[PDB]
Amino acid sequence: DSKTVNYFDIITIKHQDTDAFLHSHLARYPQRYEDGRISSAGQQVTGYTHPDFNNQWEVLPPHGDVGKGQAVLLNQHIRLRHVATDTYLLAHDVASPFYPTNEEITTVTLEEGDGELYPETLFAFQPLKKSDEGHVLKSKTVSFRLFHVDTSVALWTHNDELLPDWGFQQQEINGNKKVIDPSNNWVVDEIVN
Residues near a copy of itself, by CB under 8 A: 2, 14, 16, 19, 34-37, 52-53, 62-70, 77, 83-86, 95, 98-101, 111, 118-119, 127-132, 140-141, 143, 149, 159-162, 168-169, 177, 182, 185, 187, 189
73 has which bridge partners?
136
Rg (CA), the chain: 15
Q: Which is nearer to a copy of itself, 1 or 185 (CB)?
A: 185
Q: Which is nearer to a copy of itself, 28 or 84 (CB)?
A: 84
Cβ at position 1, least distance to a copy of itself in Å: 32
Paired with 145 in beta bridges are 126, 185
Smallest distance from a copy of itself to CB 106, Å = 18
Distance (Å, whole) CA 27 – CA 100: 21
Least distance between a copy of itself and beta carbon 182 (Å): 7
What minimum distance in Å lies between the beta carbon of 86 and a copy of itself?
7
Q: Cβ closer to a copy of itself: 1 or 58?
A: 58
CB of 48 to a copy of itself, least distance (A): 12
Which of 85, 100, 12, 101 lies closest to 42 in space, CA to CA?
85
**Which residues pair with residue 176 across a beta bridge?**
154
Instruction: Indicate the residue among 45 and 189 with the shorter CB distance to a copy of itself.
Output: 189
Residue numbers after which the chain breaks, C to N beyond 2.5 angstroms: 64
Query: One-letter amino acid identity for 68?
Result: K
In sequence order, what are the residues at sequence separation of 6 or more whose Cβ sits closer than 8 angstroms to the Cβ of residue 95? 37, 101, 102, 103, 104
Judged by beta carbon, residue 1 or residue 3, the one nearer a copy of itself is: 3
With beta carbons less than 8 A apart as the criterion, state whether 105 and 90 touch. Answer: yes
Q: How far apart are alpha carbons 56 and 64 in whole angstroms?
A: 24
CB of 128 to a copy of itself, least distance (A): 4
Closer to a copy of itself by CB, 1 or 35: give it.
35
